[PDB]
Amino acid sequence: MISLIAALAVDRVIGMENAMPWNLPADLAWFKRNTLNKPVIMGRHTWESIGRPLPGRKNIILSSQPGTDDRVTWVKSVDEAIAACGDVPEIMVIGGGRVYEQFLPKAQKLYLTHIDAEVEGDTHFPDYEPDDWESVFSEFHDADAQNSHSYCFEILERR
Amino acid sequence: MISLIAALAVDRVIGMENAMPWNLPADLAWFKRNTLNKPVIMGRHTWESIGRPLPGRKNIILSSQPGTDDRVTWVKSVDEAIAACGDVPEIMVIGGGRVYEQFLPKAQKLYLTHIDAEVEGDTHFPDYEPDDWESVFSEFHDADAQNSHSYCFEILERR
Numbered sequence: 001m002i003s004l005i006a007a008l009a010v011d012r013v014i015g016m017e018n019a020m021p022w023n024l025p026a027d028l029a030w031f032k033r034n035t036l037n038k039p040v041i042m043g044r045h046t047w048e049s050i051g052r053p054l055p056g057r058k059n060i061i062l063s064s065q066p067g068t069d070d071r072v073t074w075v076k077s078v079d080e081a082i083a084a085c086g087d088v089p090e091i092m093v094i095g096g097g098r099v100y101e102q103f104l105p106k107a108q109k110l111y112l113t114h115i116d117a118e119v120e121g122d123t124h125f126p127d128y129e130p131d132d133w134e135s136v137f138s139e140f141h142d143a144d145a146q147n148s149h150s151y152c153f154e155i156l157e158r159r
Numbered sequence: 160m161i162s163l164i165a166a167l168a169v170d171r172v173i174g175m176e177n178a179m180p181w182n183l184p185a186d187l188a189w190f191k192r193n194t195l196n197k198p199v200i201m202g203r204h205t206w207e208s209i210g211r212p213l214p215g216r217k218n219i220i221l222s223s224q225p226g227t228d229d230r231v232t233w234v235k236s237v238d239e240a241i242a243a244c245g246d247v248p249e250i251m252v253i254g255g256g257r258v259y260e261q262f263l264p265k266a267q268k269l270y271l272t273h274i275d276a277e278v279e280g281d282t283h284f285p286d287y288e289p290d291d292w293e294s295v296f297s298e299f300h301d302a303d304a305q306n307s308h309s310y311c312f313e314i315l316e317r318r
C-alpha cells in the first residue's frame with residue numbers, strides 16, 4: 001500500500017519559504033521509526049532541504065528534472081516512482097504538498113504529527129475527509145526540554 | 160578568562176525549561192566552533208535539554224542537587240566551577256539564566272546570537288552595559304531552507 005507521513009502545524013500547514021520554526025526531535029524519531037527499511041518517495045525540494053539520503057531507506061525523488069545526486073533514484077511519474085519501489089508491502093510518501101496531492105487518492109494510510117504551531121504557511125497538506133479515515137492511534141505530548149511545541153501522533157486508515 | 164555564549168531572541172529572552180521555537184543549525188555550528196576543546200559551565204535545565212555530555216568539552220554542571228550522570232563534573236558553586244576548569248585560556252559559560260547572572264561580572268567576552276524570534280518568556284539574558292562592552296564582530300544572516308530564522312553573530316569585549 002501507499003502511506004503518507006506528514007507533520008502539520010495549525011491549518012494543515014506543512015511548509016514555509018524557510019525552515020519550520022520548531023525543534024521537534026521526537027517527531028524526527030517518530031518519522032524514522034515509521035519509514036526505516038521502506039522506500040521513501042519525496043519531491044525535489046524536500047530532497048534539497050534534507051541535503052542527504054535518509055539512511056537505510058530507498059530514496060526516490062520525483063521531479064521532471066535531470067537528477068543531481070547519484071546516491072538516489074530520480075523518477076518523473078507517480079507510476080514510475082511506484083515501479084521503482086518494486087515488491088514492498090508499504091511505500092512511504094514523505095512530501096511535499098504536490099507529492100501528497102498526487103498520492104493521496106492512492107494512499108491507504110496516514111501517519112500524522114499534529115503540531116500546535118500557529119504559523120503562516122506556503123504549503124498545506126490537502127484536505128482529506130474525517131469520515132473516509134479511521135483514527136487507529138493517537139498520542140499527545142507536551143513540549144519539553146528537547147521539543148519546542150506540543151504535538152500529537154496519529155495514524156488513520158481508509159474506511 | 161570567562162566568556163558567556165548565548166542565543167537571544169527579541170527582548171533578550173532566553174530559554175527557560177522547554178526548547179526554543181526555532182531551528183537554527185548554523186547557531187549550533189557556531190556554538191560548537193566556539194566551545195570545542197574548552198571547558199563548558201551550565202546549569203541543570205540546559206543539561207536536560209542537551210541530553211548528554213558535549214563531545215570534546217569538559218562538562219561542568221552547576222546545580223545544588225545531586226549529580227545524575229557521571230560522565231560530567233557537578234558543582235555546587237561558581238568558585239568551584241572555576242577550579243574544575245583548572246587554568247585554561249577560556250572557559251565558556253553556556254547558560255542558562257541564573258548561570259549567566261552569577262558570571263557576567265567576571266566576564267570579559269560575550270558571543271551573542273541575536274535571533275529575530277519573538278518568544279514569550281520569563282527569563283532574559285542579563286542586562287549588558289553598553290559603555291562597558293564593546294562590539295568587535297557582527298555578522299547578519301538570512302533564514303534559509305535549514306535555518307528557520309534570520310540571525311546575527313556578535314562578540315563583545317568588556318572594556
Ligand SMILES: CN(Cc1cnc2nc(N)nc(N)c2n1)c1ccc(C(=O)N[C@H](CCC(=O)O)C(=O)O)cc1
Nearest residue numbers: 005006007027028029031032049050054094095112113
Ligand atoms: C525536511 N525533512 C522532511 C520531514 C521532516 N519531518 C517530518 N515529520 C513527519 N511526521 N513527516 C514527514 N513527512 C517529515 N518530513 C527531514 C529532515 C531531517 C531528517 C533526519 O535527518 N532525521 C531523522 C533522524 C533524526 C536525526 O538524526 O536528527 C531521519 O532519519 O529521518 C528527515 C527528514
Ligand SMILES: CN(Cc1cnc2nc(N)nc(N)c2n1)c1ccc(C(=O)N[C@H](CCC(=O)O)C(=O)O)cc1
Nearest residue numbers: 164165166186187188190191205208209213253254272
Ligand atoms: C540545548 N543546547 C544548549 C544551547 C543551545 N544553543 C546554544 N547556542 C548558543 N549560541 N549558546 C548557548 N549557550 C547555547 N546553548 C545545545 C543542544 C545541542 C548541542 C549539540 O547537540 N551539539 C553541538 C553541535 C550541533 C550538532 O552536534 O549537531 C555541539 O556543541 O557539539 C549543543 C547545545
Ligand SMILES: [Ca+2]
Nearest residue numbers: 134135136137
Ligand atoms: Ca479505535
Ligand SMILES: [Cl-]
Nearest residue numbers: 043044045046
Ligand atoms: Cl519537494
Ligand SMILES: [Cl-]
Nearest residue numbers: 202203204205
Ligand atoms: Cl538549571
